[PDB]
Amino acid sequence: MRHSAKSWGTGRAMARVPRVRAGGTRRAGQGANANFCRGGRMFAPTNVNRRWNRKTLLSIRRYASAMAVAATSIPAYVEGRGHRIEQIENIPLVLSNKIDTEKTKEGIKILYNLGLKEELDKVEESKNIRAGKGKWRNRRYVLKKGPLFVYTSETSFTKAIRNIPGVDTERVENLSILDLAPGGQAGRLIIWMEDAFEKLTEIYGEMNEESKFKKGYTM
Amino acid sequence: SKGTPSNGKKNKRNHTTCCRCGSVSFHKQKGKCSSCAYPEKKMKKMQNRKAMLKKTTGTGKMRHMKKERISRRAGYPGNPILKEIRNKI
Amino acid sequence: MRGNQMLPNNHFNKGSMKFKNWFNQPMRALKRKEVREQKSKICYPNPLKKLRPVVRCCSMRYNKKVRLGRGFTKMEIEKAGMDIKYAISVGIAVDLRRKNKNEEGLEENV
Amino acid sequence: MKFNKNVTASRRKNRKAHFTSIGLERTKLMNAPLSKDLKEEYGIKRIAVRPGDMVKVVSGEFKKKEGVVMKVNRHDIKIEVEGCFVQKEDGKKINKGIHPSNLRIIKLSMEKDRAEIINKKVEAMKSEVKA
Amino acid sequence: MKINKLNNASKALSYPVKKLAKTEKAPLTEKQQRSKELKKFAMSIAREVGGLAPYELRATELLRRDEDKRCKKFMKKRLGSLKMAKKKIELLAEEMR
RNA sequence: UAGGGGCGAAAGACCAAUCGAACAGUCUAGUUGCUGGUUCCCUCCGAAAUGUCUAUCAGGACAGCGCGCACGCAGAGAGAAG
RNA sequence: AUACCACACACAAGGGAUCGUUUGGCUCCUGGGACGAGGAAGGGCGCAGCAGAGAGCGAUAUGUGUGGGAGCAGCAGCAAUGACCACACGUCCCCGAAUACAGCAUAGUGCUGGAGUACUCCUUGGAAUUAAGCAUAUGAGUAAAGGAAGGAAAAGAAACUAACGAGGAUUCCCGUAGUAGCGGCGAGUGAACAGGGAACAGUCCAACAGUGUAAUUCUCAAAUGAGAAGUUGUCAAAAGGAAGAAGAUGUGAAUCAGAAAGAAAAGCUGAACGAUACAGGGUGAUAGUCCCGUAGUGUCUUCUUACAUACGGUGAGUAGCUGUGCUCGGUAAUGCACAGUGAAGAGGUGGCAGUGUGCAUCUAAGACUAAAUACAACAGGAGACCGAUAGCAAAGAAGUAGGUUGACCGAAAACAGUGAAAUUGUGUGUGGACCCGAAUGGAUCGGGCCCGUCUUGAAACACGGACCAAGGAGUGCACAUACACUGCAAGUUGAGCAGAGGAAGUCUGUGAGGCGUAGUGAAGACGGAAAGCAGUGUGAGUGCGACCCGAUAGACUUGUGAACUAUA
């Protein structure tokens, strides 16, 4: 909308679009402001007042996270997401405390002993450059999802495992649905810490009782 | 007639180069510049926002203002021969 | 205008009207946290907040509810054996505009 | 992962920083690895290649060749090595430039300030290594 | 609508508190007395030096003829307030006596 | 001597190819009951150009005739016989 | 149809679509908010070995000092006697507030002027538009024009609310509320206290200064003197500190080889190794270990901040009143002015005019004040944004080339990639405008008027359309609503805000308000049926540019014009 423009009106054998007032340049007499014009203004310009976020009831958020946690212990769902678990003895996995690990070297040896080798390899081999214009806008590489580790108490193991591709970490008390159901499909593979697994009873309570940690919520 | 033949008589020139702004807009008979209002003390009111931004600070060189910012960054240190005067003051 | 509705009344006629968005909400929250933290170091052993009196709320609708007020009165402070200069040094708030009109309200603040 | 928020991870910003570099930052672009023996003779692991030094080409058309560095083009980041060339229709021969990182140093040119440059870097290490 | 359900009689009820008596401030110290005396004194000297204003003369003249209700109306129109008029009439009356 | 102003041996003439109210720029994307245009496939159902009120007669609103979702259900654009 | 016209296919022309790419734009967040008589901002002119534009710099037109260290892009010459870069300093032509000046203060030195003005304060003040016409009203105390200041500005410690069992400076957020009311009672307009929070801080002058001596400020001298201001009244006390924050910069792990194939391996295949570092960028195809970094760790430099005296209850052309004009939701006057008139020392107020009288609450006509709040230029970080007819007008010497008498107006052009259609030549085939149905070795047979659009009615002697590519029109927000889907249910809820957390996500508290749990009246007053609340979306109404394009006109400027033409 920058330019000085006006319509020539009828009687000149031309369409009555606004035109640019100028002289000495090829720009004289060209068609100015409308959406059907080169260099004109777009239809309904995009605007900051749009509603970016969305609400969801707290009671649904609580219930969805509870049944996402449940699905992490049904083999049919875990396999269905594409985690491969052929070599793993039993689900769920619960690592002890008194893990005294500090180095990545010894950290991987632990994970291999739980049967996770094929799963981890599946992640490392996956790295590829994205198709389309997203590769220009800071979203260049894509990787497959792998195990999530859940802890509750501060331990050295967290900074021993984190550089291994596809390993992900969160605390039990603030466990998110984006981490528990990626892409909106449920049944992510989870490594529990022994403290964290016991805490699930305080957090979600018992059937037909009220949780002390989540006020006003019952299963 | 008012078209082509009247164009032949157009050999006088009412505006010359202004000494304040350069813009070939000083009207000799009126004694006034149509771009910048010389000889009035203040500069003229510019007609619109588009036209005034074409002559703002930062459209030229800003020689003094740039040096001042660098000296302020450095803590106004002055000429190193004369440090004792600075320190006393 | 057609059909049955509550008759409109939407006030968007004024072309000089301003809009205020809230995209800064999470960031300004983080700044307020960081200012409190550093303020808390400057006076480390002492609480960041002062002690305030309990007063009774205003109208017939809120009579039965008690709330924090602005400051203790010279009479409350004196009755508890302190002096005004000392009270300030120990982090008690003072308000010399307030008046005492009940026995009960005085006894509780003491 | 990066936890410092003052450093950029934008593709657009990283690329501009590369090509518009000047001064000492430009010199960092001309670094090459030293061979295993030289990494015992001197403390350093890598140095900026200069004329007169002796290099093995480890990638490309001229792989396995050895020779003396003739010239260093800083604007178009390339090094010319003695005996790596192509012949035109005319029979005339043109030296083809190789990117620094495809080379490895075999013998160092010790003319001029090189011995002081090396000393300065060794000291900078030890200063913090021993602490 | 959660408005206008009680009658005016029941809205007038109140809780039985125990009150505190007001602390009277009647004592006036020696220095405060001299302060007030000097101000009242100064007000005498001004009246002695400069005399009465035109409407005060016209007012006092009406008081001698017992034109009480005329004087009242006159003073109301000059000062605006019926209270100020009642006060100024009483001060003028006392001056004449 | 400058724009609701000038200047006119008066024609509403002339004031930078513009004058029964100049040019530049902004308010402004002024308003429009009026003219023009309005971008993929198949399946199923399917109108109205009439009444009342209107500074109303090239426009509206309310009702009448379509379609969608349908709680439910003895009815019918035809005859007899009084 | 030998050669014309049309169509199909192959090759050569002609043009620049499409796909692949991007040292640019845009949006949000955080920091910053640094000019001038010591000559600014803006304009002109000069300076290179070969030098037009642009960049850099002033006749010192690549000088000095500090920290580094290898080349100067072409050609000729230079360079460890220091190429080039980074930090500071020195030098800095002419015009311009432009001043050998104007106004003004002190014992004296001096100060102001111009630039910028997004955000803040003070004046002045429209019309288009809506009311389906229009004059009060609306748009709007908005646009435009003037004055002024700072990193914020303004405001600020009650001549304040309230009628409770009361509270207690100012500013900001949630809310009371599209309510009480104002209004050709039409269109439309429209606040306050409460209740929940962020941040918190109070003080000065006058009234009112030692009289057994102006004890007070300044100048010159001197080691104790002279003089100026002032009795129309001067003079009312502390050093001091470690914390807190922002930058700059050093260091920083670990790989080799091969068949086939390619211009080139980093791919693929086997064997290893690092990780508190698998963020991201560069290398001749897709790299943790080839190069620059990153996680982790060192140093250094700046900036911010902190103890003393004496006091109260009368601040005048003011408050108020009469008339008048503007203004506000303020209504028998909410605020502000002008003219007449004009107080008391005791006065002001308690949303409806007056008079009286108790009661409650305050103290005007002098001043200062932090934090929590707003937003350009310039710098830094991010993104479900745009990808060269897009995104800023501008991805190159863009406010440029160029243009107006003037105010002012204003383009195109990416890769030495790919290489579509319109349109042209040559060769080879098939037809005489072309489409649909059905066929021959071969003459052809039957059916079809030109599309889009308003219209009772178009093949029309109704209008738009020469041809091809690319662009090109029901969208966003607020408020009620009916339907479909989801959780809980006499209840329900992501208000703001706090606590946790390598964090614009998520989890947990505290805790208002709103609507519902039953209605009737103008009201006093009375009381007796019917599941709701909050979301995710769809159809539809109203207001904002409101599906896209289009008037003749109206207003406003401290903007321009008598080079053509009129008259002195």
Ligand SMILES: [Zn+2]
């Ligand atoms: Zn000028």
